[PDB]
From Swiss-Prot, chain A:
Protein name: Estrogen receptor
Domain comment, as recorded: Composed of three domains: a modulating N-terminal domain, a DNA-binding domain and a C-terminal ligand-binding domain. The modulating domain, also known as A/B or AF-1 domain has a ligand-independent transactivation function. The C-terminus contains a ligand-dependent transactivation domain, also known as E/F or AF-2 domain which overlaps with the ligand binding domain. AF-1 and AF-2 activate transcription independently and synergistically and act in a promoter- and cell-specific manner. AF-1 seems to provide the major transactivation function in differentiated cells.
Tissue expression summary: Widely expressed. Not expressed in the pituitary gland.
Complete-protein stretch covered: 306 to 528 of 595
Misc: Selective estrogen receptor modulators (SERMs), such as tamoxifen, raloxifene, toremifene, lasofoxifene, clomifene, femarelle and ormeloxifene, have tissue selective agonistic and antagonistic effects on the estrogen receptor (ER). They interfere with the ER association with coactivators or corepressors, mainly involving the AF-2 domain.
Post-translational modification (record): Phosphorylated by cyclin A/CDK2 and CK1. Phosphorylation probably enhances transcriptional activity. Self-association induces phosphorylation. Phosphorylated by LMTK3 in vitro.
Residues covered by region (Transactivation AF-2): 6-204
Region Interaction with AKAP13, residue ranges: 1-204
Protein location: Nucleus; Golgi apparatus; Cell membrane
Domain of life of the native organism: Eukaryota
Covalently lipidated residues, kind S-palmitoyl cysteine: C132
Length: 204, 207
């Protein structure tokens, strides 16, 4: 199972499962087109998430319907870290705050996205950490609105992994749990952005 | 000065700051909505007082104090609700003289879903053996984290609360591994309370 993998194997597995950075092929049409092409990859990525495929098809689908937008958003935020003030939706679709105002109600979400991006930059989020957070989001957003014990052992597994990475990075015990906490609190914001995002979508 | 408190002082200050449990005054969609809102308005007053006793909160500008309370008040009301609904399986203790089960949620249009979410969370708390000391720490984190990205001072209090939480677990006898694992389970649930607050605002803003 996934419960038997070591911290290094979990990370290595997660890294190798990573989806590719897709390209942007009226504003909304590009984002939905890009988002929809991204969705196909997400699914195949989910199946590579240790612990995921051990669930019933119904649960696998419930977990994806629940977190797909948070997942797209954390990926968006991730590739935007080295472009302060901008959101890199795709290598050929990097938009800034002003371009957001273009669509109705999008400036509020952009600012939250940029803010979450600064936070990651300010924190120096590592790629190894990032893939862990993304998996935690997958297994955690639909888990309370549903197996369950399995999901919780896997989440503890990823937590161990996260801590393991910090230990190796050289952080002290106290820094380790302080960072884990900071990283996890950010998921609340991502959850919040996803909710706003859904509202913005449903109104179209 | 709040950044100078020890894990034990932090706990004491938080438990002392705790606001009181209020009482409410078949239900129709109209009266039930009035009972809940009346209770909420009265609770909000004590929350603001409680907010001011949260280490580092008053050190913030008035504009930031208002932003934090404005974005987190429902999450705070709901975590309090979930907390006092632990011992009452399948029910929500909005107040002693107001314990509603899921069926009394259908009374209001589209509230039964918020109800199921709230109840599930209550189960998770019960299931996790959530302790009052841990509970006051989460509530505080909720307050300070809800609008922090929409600052340096705020993150130190948070780190202070993280250490307290761990401290509480260490004393309880959990191994280092169990400490980090429990810390995560607790924090991942704030993600769900956030969602509930969000669906809650939608429902409230809907009428
Ligand atoms: C960004 O504002 C949220 C947002 C608001 C909205 O009304 C519509 C959309 C939004 O994010 C876009 C997105 C595209 C690619 C990504 O990697 C992430 C998100 C797509 C996702 C679904 C429709 C469209
Ligand atoms: C199902 O609750 C969501 C909910 C939906 C809604 O449309 C209206 C309300 C709700 O929660 C109630 C609540 C009252 C006391 C508490 O301790 C916690 C929540 C109050 C809070 C603001 C208006 C009312």
């Amino acid at each position: 199972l996934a419960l038997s993998l070591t911290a290094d194997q979990m990370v290595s597995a997660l890294l190798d499962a990573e989806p590719p950075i897709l390209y942007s092929e009226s504003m909304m049409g590009l984002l939905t087109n890009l988002a929809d092409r991204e969705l196909v990859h997400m699914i195949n990525w989910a199946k590579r998430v240790p612990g995921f495929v051990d669930l019933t098809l119904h649960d696998q689908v419930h977990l994806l319907e629940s977190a797909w937008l948070e997942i797209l958003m954390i990926g968006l935020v991730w590739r935007s870290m080295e472009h302060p003030g901008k959101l890199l939706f795709a290598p050929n679709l990097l938009l800034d705050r002003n371009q957001g105002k273009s669509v109705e109600g999008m400036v509020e979400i952009f600012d939250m996205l940029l803010a979450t991006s600064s936070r990651f930059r300010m924190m120096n989020l590592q790629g190894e950490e990032f893939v862990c957070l993304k998996s935690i989001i997958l297994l955690n957003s639909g888990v309370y609105t549903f197996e369950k014990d399995h999901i919780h052992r896997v989440l503890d597994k990823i937590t161990d992994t996260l801590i393991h990475l910090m230990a190796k990075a050289g952080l002290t015990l106290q820094q380790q749990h302080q960072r884990l906490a900071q990283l996890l609190l950010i998921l609340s914001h991502i959850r919040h952005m996803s909710n706003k995002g859904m509202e913005h979508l449903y109104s179209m």
